């Protein structure tokens, strides 16, 4: 019921390491997100395996898996390699070279593909990232999870953790009534560098970021999400 909908754009650029194929062999790529949405690039010749192809997808998964497969056609079609990408809304939107897994029955071992993968920021998502966290009633084990701060109403907000390839958060915390602030590193919690918490009558959630620049952005975002009057006290 706390649903996000992301635009996912995949721009397949080119491949390198395609030496075995004849120059006039047709190559193309398929790009798919788990859930049903699949797209193909145009046909390219092996002499020039390049596409300026933008594939526009759309998913409910904050942590989707993007499977890109390279094919040569003409007995079905032969897959020459694949990559599986795991992008987040914070992932780099630059073009990136990736190594493709090759069946080792074809001599294209240094076979790589250049790719851009972009997840847009929907308007009801205020902030996302990975965080160390433990709580009294939710996230009851010190563990790093992926979080999204979703605006669930004109005045209500929610801290939502997600698992891989899930449309709905695994757990969530309604932030109304909570007070967030920076805290000194809490003892006995192995993992986490820059700590903070969300606290209220009855509940306490401990948070830790790996970097303090990432902690500042979180604490400030959550301060506005809770509507607390207490201003956080940084170090």
CSV table of C-alpha atoms in Angstrom, one decimal:
chain,number,residue,atom,x,y,z
A,1,UNK,CA,0.0,0.0,0.0
A,2,UNK,CA,3.1,2.2,0.2
A,3,UNK,CA,3.9,1.8,-3.5
A,4,UNK,CA,6.6,3.5,-5.6
A,5,UNK,CA,6.8,3.4,-9.4
A,6,UNK,CA,10.2,3.9,-10.9
A,7,UNK,CA,11.1,4.8,-14.5
A,8,UNK,CA,14.0,2.5,-15.5
A,9,UNK,CA,15.9,3.5,-18.7
A,10,UNK,CA,18.6,1.2,-20.2
A,11,UNK,CA,20.9,2.6,-22.9
A,12,UNK,CA,22.9,-0.2,-24.5
A,13,UNK,CA,25.9,1.4,-26.2
A,14,UNK,CA,28.2,-1.2,-27.7
A,15,UNK,CA,30.2,-4.4,-27.0
A,16,UNK,CA,33.9,-5.2,-27.0
A,17,UNK,CA,35.7,-8.5,-27.3
A,18,UNK,CA,33.6,-10.0,-30.1
A,19,UNK,CA,36.5,-11.4,-32.2
A,20,UNK,CA,35.2,-14.9,-33.1
A,21,UNK,CA,32.2,-13.9,-35.1
A,22,UNK,CA,32.2,-13.3,-38.9
A,23,UNK,CA,32.0,-9.6,-39.7
A,24,UNK,CA,28.5,-9.9,-41.3
A,25,UNK,CA,26.9,-11.8,-38.5
A,26,UNK,CA,23.8,-10.1,-37.0
A,27,UNK,CA,24.0,-9.2,-33.3
A,28,UNK,CA,21.3,-7.8,-31.0
A,29,UNK,CA,20.6,-7.4,-27.3
A,30,UNK,CA,17.5,-8.1,-25.2
A,31,UNK,CA,17.0,-6.1,-22.0
A,32,UNK,CA,14.5,-7.2,-19.4
A,33,UNK,CA,13.3,-6.4,-15.9
A,34,UNK,CA,11.8,-9.1,-13.7
A,35,UNK,CA,8.0,-8.8,-13.9
A,36,UNK,CA,7.4,-9.1,-17.6
A,37,UNK,CA,8.8,-6.0,-19.4
A,38,UNK,CA,11.3,-7.1,-22.1
A,39,UNK,CA,12.7,-5.1,-25.0
A,40,UNK,CA,15.2,-5.6,-27.8
A,41,UNK,CA,17.8,-3.5,-29.5
A,42,UNK,CA,17.9,-3.1,-33.3
A,43,UNK,CA,20.0,-5.5,-35.4
A,44,UNK,CA,23.7,-4.7,-35.6
A,45,UNK,CA,26.5,-6.2,-37.6
A,46,UNK,CA,29.4,-7.8,-35.8
A,47,UNK,CA,31.8,-5.5,-37.6
A,48,UNK,CA,30.1,-2.6,-35.8
A,49,UNK,CA,28.3,-3.9,-32.7
A,50,UNK,CA,26.9,-0.5,-31.5
A,51,UNK,CA,23.5,0.8,-30.7
A,52,UNK,CA,22.3,4.1,-29.5
A,53,UNK,CA,19.2,2.3,-28.2
A,54,UNK,CA,17.3,3.7,-25.2
A,55,UNK,CA,15.0,1.2,-23.5
A,56,UNK,CA,12.3,2.8,-21.3
A,57,UNK,CA,11.0,0.4,-18.6
A,58,UNK,CA,8.8,0.9,-15.5
A,59,UNK,CA,8.7,-1.2,-12.3
A,60,UNK,CA,7.5,-1.2,-8.7
A,61,UNK,CA,10.8,-2.7,-7.5
A,62,UNK,CA,13.1,-0.3,-5.8
A,63,UNK,CA,15.8,-3.0,-6.2
A,64,UNK,CA,15.2,-4.5,-9.6
A,65,UNK,CA,17.4,-6.9,-11.6
A,66,UNK,CA,18.1,-5.8,-15.1
A,67,UNK,CA,19.2,-8.8,-17.3
A,68,UNK,CA,20.9,-7.8,-20.6
A,69,UNK,CA,21.7,-10.6,-23.0
A,70,UNK,CA,23.8,-10.5,-26.2
A,71,UNK,CA,22.6,-12.7,-29.1
A,72,UNK,CA,23.7,-13.7,-32.6
A,73,UNK,CA,21.0,-15.0,-34.8
A,74,UNK,CA,20.8,-17.8,-37.4
A,75,UNK,CA,18.6,-23.2,-34.7
A,76,UNK,CA,16.9,-20.6,-32.4
A,77,UNK,CA,19.3,-17.7,-31.5
A,78,UNK,CA,22.7,-18.1,-29.8
A,79,UNK,CA,23.4,-16.2,-26.6
A,80,UNK,CA,27.0,-14.9,-26.6
A,81,UNK,CA,26.9,-13.4,-23.1
A,82,UNK,CA,24.8,-11.8,-20.4
A,83,UNK,CA,25.0,-9.3,-17.5
A,84,UNK,CA,22.6,-8.9,-14.6
A,85,UNK,CA,22.6,-5.4,-13.2
A,86,UNK,CA,21.2,-4.4,-9.8
A,87,UNK,CA,20.6,-0.6,-9.8
A,88,UNK,CA,19.1,1.5,-7.1
A,89,UNK,CA,17.7,5.1,-7.4
A,90,UNK,CA,21.1,6.3,-6.1
A,91,UNK,CA,23.1,4.2,-8.6
A,92,UNK,CA,25.4,5.9,-11.1
A,93,UNK,CA,23.6,7.0,-14.3
A,94,UNK,CA,26.8,7.2,-16.3
A,95,UNK,CA,27.7,4.7,-19.0
A,96,UNK,CA,29.6,1.8,-17.6
A,97,UNK,CA,31.6,-1.1,-19.0
A,98,UNK,CA,30.5,-4.5,-17.7
A,99,UNK,CA,32.0,-8.0,-18.3
A,100,UNK,CA,29.6,-10.5,-19.7
A,101,UNK,CA,29.4,-14.1,-18.6
A,102,UNK,CA,30.4,-16.3,-21.5
A,103,UNK,CA,29.7,-20.0,-21.9
A,104,UNK,CA,33.4,-20.8,-22.2
A,105,UNK,CA,32.4,-22.8,-25.4
A,106,UNK,CA,33.1,-19.6,-27.4
A,107,UNK,CA,36.5,-17.8,-27.4
A,108,UNK,CA,35.1,-14.4,-26.5
A,109,UNK,CA,36.3,-14.3,-22.9
A,110,UNK,CA,37.2,-10.6,-22.7
A,111,UNK,CA,33.7,-9.9,-23.9
A,112,UNK,CA,32.2,-6.7,-22.3
A,113,UNK,CA,29.3,-4.4,-22.9
A,114,UNK,CA,28.9,-0.6,-22.3
A,115,UNK,CA,25.7,0.3,-20.5
A,116,UNK,CA,23.8,3.1,-18.9
A,117,UNK,CA,21.1,2.3,-16.3
A,118,UNK,CA,18.9,5.1,-14.9
A,119,UNK,CA,16.2,4.9,-12.2
A,120,UNK,CA,14.3,8.1,-11.9
A,121,UNK,CA,13.3,9.6,-8.6
A,122,UNK,CA,9.5,9.5,-8.2
A,123,UNK,CA,8.0,12.5,-6.6
A,124,UNK,CA,6.8,10.7,-3.5
A,125,UNK,CA,10.3,9.3,-2.8
A,126,UNK,CA,12.2,11.8,-0.6
A,127,UNK,CA,15.5,9.8,0.0
A,128,UNK,CA,16.9,6.4,-0.3
A,129,UNK,CA,20.1,4.5,0.5
A,130,UNK,CA,21.6,1.6,2.5
A,131,UNK,CA,21.7,1.9,6.2
A,132,UNK,CA,22.7,-0.1,9.2
A,133,UNK,CA,19.6,-0.3,11.5
A,134,UNK,CA,18.1,-2.1,14.5
A,135,UNK,CA,14.8,-1.4,16.2
A,136,UNK,CA,12.6,-2.5,19.1
A,137,UNK,CA,9.5,-3.2,17.0
A,138,UNK,CA,10.8,-3.3,13.4
A,139,UNK,CA,14.2,-4.3,11.9
A,140,UNK,CA,14.8,-6.3,15.1
A,141,UNK,CA,18.4,-7.3,14.1
A,142,UNK,CA,21.4,-5.1,13.4
A,143,UNK,CA,21.6,-5.5,9.6
A,144,UNK,CA,22.3,-3.4,6.6
A,145,UNK,CA,19.1,-2.9,4.5
A,146,UNK,CA,18.1,-0.6,1.6
A,147,UNK,CA,15.7,2.2,2.7
A,148,UNK,CA,13.4,4.6,0.9
A,149,UNK,CA,11.8,7.6,2.6
A,150,UNK,CA,8.4,7.7,1.0
A,151,UNK,CA,5.9,10.5,1.3
A,152,UNK,CA,2.7,8.6,2.0
A,153,UNK,CA,0.4,11.6,2.3
A,154,UNK,CA,0.5,15.4,2.2
A,155,UNK,CA,1.7,15.2,5.8
A,156,UNK,CA,2.6,11.6,6.6
A,157,UNK,CA,6.0,10.0,5.8
A,158,UNK,CA,7.4,6.5,6.2
A,159,UNK,CA,10.8,4.8,6.4
A,160,UNK,CA,10.6,1.7,4.2
A,161,UNK,CA,13.1,-1.1,3.8
A,162,UNK,CA,13.1,-3.2,0.7
A,163,UNK,CA,14.4,-6.6,-0.4
A,164,UNK,CA,15.6,-7.5,-3.8
A,165,UNK,CA,12.9,-7.7,-6.6
A,166,UNK,CA,10.1,-6.8,-4.2
A,167,UNK,CA,7.3,-4.3,-5.1
A,168,UNK,CA,6.4,-3.7,-1.4
A,169,UNK,CA,8.6,-2.9,1.6
A,170,UNK,CA,9.6,-5.7,3.9
A,171,UNK,CA,9.1,-3.5,7.0
A,172,UNK,CA,8.2,0.1,7.4
A,173,UNK,CA,8.1,2.8,10.1
A,174,UNK,CA,5.6,5.6,10.1
A,175,UNK,CA,7.7,8.6,11.1
A,176,UNK,CA,4.9,10.8,12.5
A,177,UNK,CA,5.6,11.3,16.2
A,178,UNK,CA,9.3,10.4,16.0
A,179,UNK,CA,12.4,12.5,16.9
A,180,UNK,CA,15.5,12.0,14.9
A,181,UNK,CA,19.0,13.2,15.9
A,182,UNK,CA,22.7,12.4,15.5
A,183,UNK,CA,24.1,10.1,18.1
A,184,UNK,CA,27.6,8.9,19.2
A,185,UNK,CA,28.6,5.5,17.8
A,186,UNK,CA,26.5,2.9,19.8
A,187,UNK,CA,28.5,0.1,21.5
A,188,UNK,CA,28.1,-3.6,20.7
A,189,UNK,CA,26.9,-3.0,17.1
A,190,UNK,CA,29.5,-4.4,14.7
A,191,UNK,CA,29.1,-2.5,11.4
A,192,UNK,CA,28.2,1.1,10.9
A,193,UNK,CA,30.3,4.2,11.3
A,194,UNK,CA,28.1,7.3,11.6
A,195,UNK,CA,25.2,6.6,13.9
A,196,UNK,CA,21.8,8.3,14.5
A,197,UNK,CA,18.4,7.3,15.7
A,198,UNK,CA,14.6,7.8,15.5
A,199,UNK,CA,13.1,7.9,18.9
A,200,UNK,CA,9.6,8.3,20.4
A,201,UNK,CA,7.4,7.1,23.3
A,202,UNK,CA,7.8,3.3,23.2
A,203,UNK,CA,10.0,2.8,20.2
A,204,UNK,CA,13.7,3.4,19.3
A,205,UNK,CA,15.4,2.7,16.0
A,206,UNK,CA,19.2,2.9,15.7
A,207,UNK,CA,20.7,4.0,12.4
A,208,UNK,CA,24.2,4.0,11.1
A,209,UNK,CA,25.7,5.2,7.8
A,210,UNK,CA,29.1,4.3,6.5
A,211,UNK,CA,29.9,7.9,5.7
A,212,UNK,CA,29.0,11.0,7.7
A,213,UNK,CA,28.1,13.0,4.6
A,214,UNK,CA,25.5,10.3,4.0
A,215,UNK,CA,24.4,10.5,7.7
A,216,UNK,CA,23.8,14.3,7.4
A,217,UNK,CA,21.6,13.9,4.4
A,218,UNK,CA,19.6,11.2,6.1
A,219,UNK,CA,19.1,13.0,9.4
A,220,UNK,CA,18.1,16.2,7.7
A,221,UNK,CA,15.7,14.4,5.4
A,222,UNK,CA,14.1,12.5,8.3
A,223,UNK,CA,13.9,15.7,10.4
A,224,UNK,CA,11.6,17.2,7.8
A,225,UNK,CA,9.8,13.8,7.4
A,226,UNK,CA,8.8,13.6,11.1
A,227,UNK,CA,7.7,17.2,11.7
A,228,UNK,CA,9.6,17.2,15.0
A,229,UNK,CA,10.4,20.6,16.6
A,230,UNK,CA,13.7,19.4,18.0
A,231,UNK,CA,16.6,20.5,15.7
A,232,UNK,CA,19.2,17.8,15.4
A,233,UNK,CA,22.5,18.5,17.1
A,234,UNK,CA,25.4,17.6,14.8
A,235,UNK,CA,29.0,17.1,16.0
